[PDB]
Design a protein around this nucleic acid. Structure first.
Length: 194
DNA sequence: TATATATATATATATATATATATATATATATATATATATATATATATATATATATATATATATATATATATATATATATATATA
């Protein structure tokens, strides 16, 4: 980037600077490819690992609830309610992916929990208290905290934290991963680097 | 005029050697068309759904990668203008 001098609130300057720099964006993207690809290479693994860990630990908690004698019509969690719980855990991935403190992660994930459990559990058979008990069970499996206390005090559901929350136990590495054919066909280590 | 040697034409039939046409049917060899169905081989179309493979569009959010715009201040890097 921004002009970094003053706000100068004026929409026509915004659109005109955008139209001016459209003749340079189309080449800066082509230049940006060369580090774009490697940063996605070592950034997508965190998403895919946290989504598989959510699937696995949700399956374990639901099966331990079924072994207590409940019916599989009592607890659906099929397509969109799992998508809600993946929304809160992926926002936990984001605020852990920055170098934030514990309670700042806790209250940002509590805000995302408020928005998500407000939106998509009206009209679908699942009260908010059961969903928040499920979220506390999943965090008891991951890091063993159970941080969130909830209420249905108004027409929406509201989530507030009780204790600070640790970041995700997954490190995003700064690697430069090379293929096995490049390892085998090379003649020297410096040919792999250089 | 008669005869031995060879090149072709006729006279009149019969025969061995091959090239094609008919007469009348039944075969064996192959190229294509129909009759009526059933089947194995592949090219595409529909009938109704469910699924594995990829190309893009949406439904509604939260993410990871990059291009630029703002929201509002403080910095670090450079281009010029001022204040004295």
């Amino acid at each position: 980037m921004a002009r970094k001098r003053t706000s100068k609130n004026d929409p026509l300057r915004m659109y005109l600077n955008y139209v001016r720099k459209l003749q340079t964006m189309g080449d800066a993207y082509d230049e940006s490819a060369k580090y774009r690809i490697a940063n996605f290479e070592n950034g997508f693994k965190s998403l895919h690992m946290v989504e598989n860990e959510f699937k696995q630990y949700l399956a374990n908690v639901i099966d331990e609830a079924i072994k207590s004698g409940a019916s599989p019509q009592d607890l659906p969690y099929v397509n969109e309610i799992k998508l809600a719980l993946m929304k809160i855990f992926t926002s936990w991935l984001k605020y852990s992916n920055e170098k934030l403190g514990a309670n700042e992660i806790a209250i940002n994930v509590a805000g995302t929990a408020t928005m998500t459990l407000t939106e998509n559990l009206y009209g679908t058979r699942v009260s908010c208290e059961e969903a928040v008990s499920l979220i506390n069970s999943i965090f008891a499996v991951w890091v063993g905290v159970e941080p969130f206390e909830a209420e249905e005090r108004e027409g929406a559901c509201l989530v507030t934290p009780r204790s600070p929350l640790p970041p995700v136990p997954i490190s995003s590495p700064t690697g430069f991963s090379a293929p096995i054919q490049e390892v085998l066909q090379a003649k020297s280590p410096e040919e792999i680097i250089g």
